[PDB]
């Protein structure tokens, strides 16, 4: 850091290794002041790829309070995320003749799911729906239980297109269209937090809002995911709200929506409170939906501890629960990956090996 | 570099070890 | 019209209620229903279930006495807890996971009742040691064929071990709709109450048994051992130069070192060494 | 549902990577081919081949699914995103959460905010081939259901008539060029392994200031006045 040259690798890494945040504010203000285009955006963009949640927004909300409008632009990332649309519409690669055996290979099991699925995977982010459009309409037969999977195309297709994915998806309101077929609303909240992933803000704002207002049956699911999509990491007193009231009114249909957006919501943060919550629902209630949902949760509340994770784990992954098992084995893999922490490896490969609980 | 680079695969490997042993019993 | 990877939670004392009422009329299909209730659509759960005699007419909706069926409801309510009938349970000796023509009759019937009335296949004579079947499925309307068929829903769950049987496919059940998933309520204070008080082994392990029958089992054991002496002779005079593993897969004779393990050698030596340790531990005790 | 998760691993492992990774590439993807293909495979393994199929052409060999960071790091999202898409024995239709975890890559040379200049790399190592191979495109099908005539004996000696009366009544472009010295606008798709046999173009007027050997965003040098080399990828 202290090098006379201000070069961009070690200032930008050694920073987050050593976890200053205020110090790599500083110098980005330092740089801004200078404007030394070169280094302060190179700088920005390397602390916006190798830093990560926490960091980046504490590092910004230092510098907010010559280039600060550009350095806050870039560390919000919406012009890093239009570069890769605009690369993934130049770029973008698609098989018609994939298309076509894939509906070949469709049949009424799960497969012709699978194959909107795949041709969705291939045609991502092509803002064009005429084969997709054409696939939908030939597989609108079967719902009620592929909506779901065929909103999740949609969503995949149109990711982060909110200018015109938003009114693409909004083209298909529920109530009118098929009171019947209640999963036209879901599929519709679920593709509307798809296409708006990697947003936030107003994107959480309008999301949490239409979930206040709106029924409790089928919405849910895809509203609680799309909201927590967008709350990331976040862990925001209004959507931590509503998720507690969703998970605690013993609502078990959508309580896996609620508990994977407790999860999102609390991505990271390795809240002890969080944690305490998941596990005492987990003995107060007995719904499969509600412990896989938890299941999620508990399963991104925390990464890169190897503190509170070890002792945490031990805890929970041997609890009585199989769910609790899986779901404790999750945080302690994904809190101990990025290194072959020997504790973590050895409890994950013993309760692999030991026990014969299938789950 | 070779010297911290043989710890860890030591590591790993002693552990690995003892680790699949366990299923003997 | 609409059916999920369902799943039965179903009780251990349900269990122990099945097998014994099909112990008991093995030769006679003795009827029941299974007592559970759908707390949503598709996590069904079964706390209880009763048994009901089969009437001399044989599998009928009348056989189920209604005011029968009222009574035993009201002294549940009134001692026990409540419990409502969307299920039925039925031990079938004549053949698997399928129901016959009756049987389906009957649950058409169960299912103009209830809203699903889960049509239930235990089967009590194949259930021996360790494979007990209790298969669910759902009697279906001719229009689930003609829309989208195979009812199972968009999920990858109950895919997961589904081998229906051969007659349950040649039938409509177990075809019309789908195979319901089974989980057993393995909650603690019930499960670590039966671990720890069933299966009750706890100054049983003290015995010492030296010689009761012991003197006479090594010299079993002996002759034993001097058949293995003969076979692991013969192998080693067979023993030929030519790869060996070519002459031992035409000509295996379970000897020693193929068949007869060195396991056995370790269970006898197991045997001799726990009475071994029992009678030396005892003898210390002895102070 | 084992075989299915291990064609979805498999596709994963081949994803964004061609034959010159491994021979076997181009064998899995005809084998994911002919699953696909296969309609009287199990439910459950033609979900997951099919699915296998869609993850290793997401995006058409334009995104993917990485945990590696630019320094190295757990991309936690993406982490997370792979254990939703795993839990599709919980729930398949839940399974569908992995969109977040796309990690495309691009070199980029933006140095104005709006302005994208027209910053390009070469390649010069042969074994290294990526950007759409398209590997099923073209059928070359035909329906002839045509069996030869069996004529033996005094047809044939009439045959023997009719041969005595009927008797009078790109090498240049396959050996050296294979198309591996192109040039790449700023937004382009490739590999860290694809930028170690990657050679810098020097002779360029563009020369980077963060060092061309890791991927990443790198800002272009205010160039040489009179701008020119504007591209609109």
């Not at chain 1, 007995?286 to 509170?308: P, W």
């Amino acid at each position: 850091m202290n090098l006379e040259k201000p070069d961009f690798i070690n200032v930008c890494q050694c920073l987050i290794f050593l976890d200053d945040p205020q110090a790599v504010s500083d110098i980005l203000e330092k740089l801004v002041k200078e404007d030394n285009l070169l280094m302060a955006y190179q700088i920005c963009f390397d602390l916006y790829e190798s830093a990560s949640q926490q960091f980046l927004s504490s590092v910004i909300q230092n510098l907010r309070t010559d280039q600060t409008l550009k350095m806050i632009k870039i560390l919000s990332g919406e012009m890093a995320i239009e570069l890769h649309l605009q690369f993934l519409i130049r770029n973008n690669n698609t098989d018609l003749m994939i298309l076509k055996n894939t509906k070949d290979a469709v049949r009424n099991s799960v497969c012709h799911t699978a194959t909107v699925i795949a041709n969705s995977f291939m045609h991502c982010g092509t803002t064009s729906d005429q084969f997709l459009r054409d696939n939908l309409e030939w597989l609108a037969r079967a719902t009620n239980w592929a909506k779901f999977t065929a909103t999740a195309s949609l969503g995949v297709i149109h990711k982060g297109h909110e200018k015109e994915a938003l009114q693409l998806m909004a083209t298909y309101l529920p109530k009118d269209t098929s009171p019947g077929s209640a999963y036209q609303e879901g599929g519709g909240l679920y593709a509307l937090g798809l296409i708006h992933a990697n947003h936030g803000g107003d994107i959480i704002d309008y999301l949490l809002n239409q979930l206040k207002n709106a029924s409790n049956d089928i919405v849910r699911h895809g509203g609680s995911l799309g909201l927590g999509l967008a709350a990331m990491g976040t862990a925001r007193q209004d959507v931590y709200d509503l998720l507690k009231t969703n998970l605690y009114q013993d609502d078990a249909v959508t309580g896996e929506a609620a508990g994977l957006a407790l999860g999102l919501v609390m991505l990271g943060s390795k809240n002890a409170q969080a944690i305490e919550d998941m596990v005492g629902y987990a003995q107060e209630t007995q719904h499969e939906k509600i412990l896989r949902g938890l299941a999620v949760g508990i399963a991104l509340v925390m990464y890169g501890r190897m503190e509170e994770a070890d002792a945490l784990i031990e805890s929970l992954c041997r609890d009585k629960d199989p769910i609790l098992r899986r779901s404790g084995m999750y945080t302690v893999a994904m809190a101990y990956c990025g290194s072959g922490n020997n504790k973590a490896i050895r409890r994950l490969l013993h309760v692999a090996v030991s026990d014969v609980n299938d789950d | 570099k070779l010297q911290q680079e043989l710890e860890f695969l030591e590591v790993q490997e002693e552990y690995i070890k003892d680790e699949q042993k366990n299923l003997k019993k | 019209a609409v059916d999920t990877a369902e799943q039965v939670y179903i009780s251990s004392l349900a269990l122990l209620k099945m097998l014994k009422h099909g112990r008991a009329g093995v030769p006679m299909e003795v009827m029941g229903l299974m007592l559970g209730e759908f707390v949503d659509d598709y996590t069904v759960r079964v706390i209880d279930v009763f048994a009901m005699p089969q009437s001399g007419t044989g599998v009928s909706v009348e056989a189920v006495d209604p005011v029968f069926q009222a009574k035993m409801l009201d002294m549940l309510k009134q001692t026990g807890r409540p419990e409502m009938v969307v299920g039925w349970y039925h031990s079938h000796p004549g053949f698997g996971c399928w129901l016959s023509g009756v049987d389906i009759n009957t649950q058409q019937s169960f299912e103009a009742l209830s809203e699903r009335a889960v049509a239930v296949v235990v089967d009590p004579i194949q259930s021996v040691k360790g494979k007990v079947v209790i298969d669910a499925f759902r009697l279906i309307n001719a229009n689930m064929m003609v829309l989208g068929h195979e009812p199972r829903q968009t999920t990858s769950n109950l895919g997961h071990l589904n081998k229906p049987s051969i007659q349950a496919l040649i039938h409509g059940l177990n075809r019309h709709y789908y195979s319901i998933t089974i989980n057993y309520r393995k909650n603690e204070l019930e499960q670590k109450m039966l671990l720890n008080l069933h299966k009750k082994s706890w100054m049983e392990g003290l015995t010492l048994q030296d010689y009761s029958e012991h003197c006479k089992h090594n010299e079993s054991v002996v002759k034993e051992m001097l058949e293995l002496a003969k076979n692991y002779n013969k192998a080693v005079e067979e023993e030929d130069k030519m790869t060996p593993e070519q002459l031992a897969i035409k000509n295996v004779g379970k000897q020693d070192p193929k068949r007869h393990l060195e396991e056995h050698v370790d269970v006898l030596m197991t045997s001799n060494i726990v009475q071994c340790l029992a009678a030396m531990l005892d003898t210390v005790v002895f102070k | 549902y084992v075989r299915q998760g291990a064609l979805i691993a498999s596709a994963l492992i081949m994803i964004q990577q061609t034959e010159i990774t491994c021979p076997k590439v181009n064998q899995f993807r005809q084998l994911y081919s002919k699953v696909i293909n296969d309609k009287h495979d199990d439910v459950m393994a033609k979900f997951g081949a099919i699915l296998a199929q869609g993850i290793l052409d997401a995006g058409g060999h334009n995104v993917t699914i990485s945990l590696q960071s630019r320094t190295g790091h757990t991309h936690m999202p993406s982490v997370v995103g792979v254990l939703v898409f795993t839990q599709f024995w919980f729930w398949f239709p839940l399974s569908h959460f992995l969109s977040l975890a796309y990690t495309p890559t691009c070199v980029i040379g933006l140095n104005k905010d709006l302005k994208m200049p027209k910053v390009q790399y070469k390649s010069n190592c042969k074994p290294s081939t990526f950007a759409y191979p398209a590997p099923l495109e073209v059928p070359k099908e035909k329906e002839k259901e045509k069996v030869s005539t069996a004529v033996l004996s005094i047809t044939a000696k009439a045959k023997k008539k009719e041969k005595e009366k009927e008797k009078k009544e790109e090498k240049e472009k396959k050996k050296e060029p294979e198309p591996n010295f192109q040039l790449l606008d700023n937004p382009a798709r490739v590999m860290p392994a694809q930028l170690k046999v990657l050679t810098m173009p020097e002779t360029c007027r563009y020369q980077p200031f963060k060092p061309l050997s890791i991927g990443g965003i790198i800002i272009l040098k205010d160039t040489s006045e009179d701008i020119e080399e504007l591209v609109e990828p």
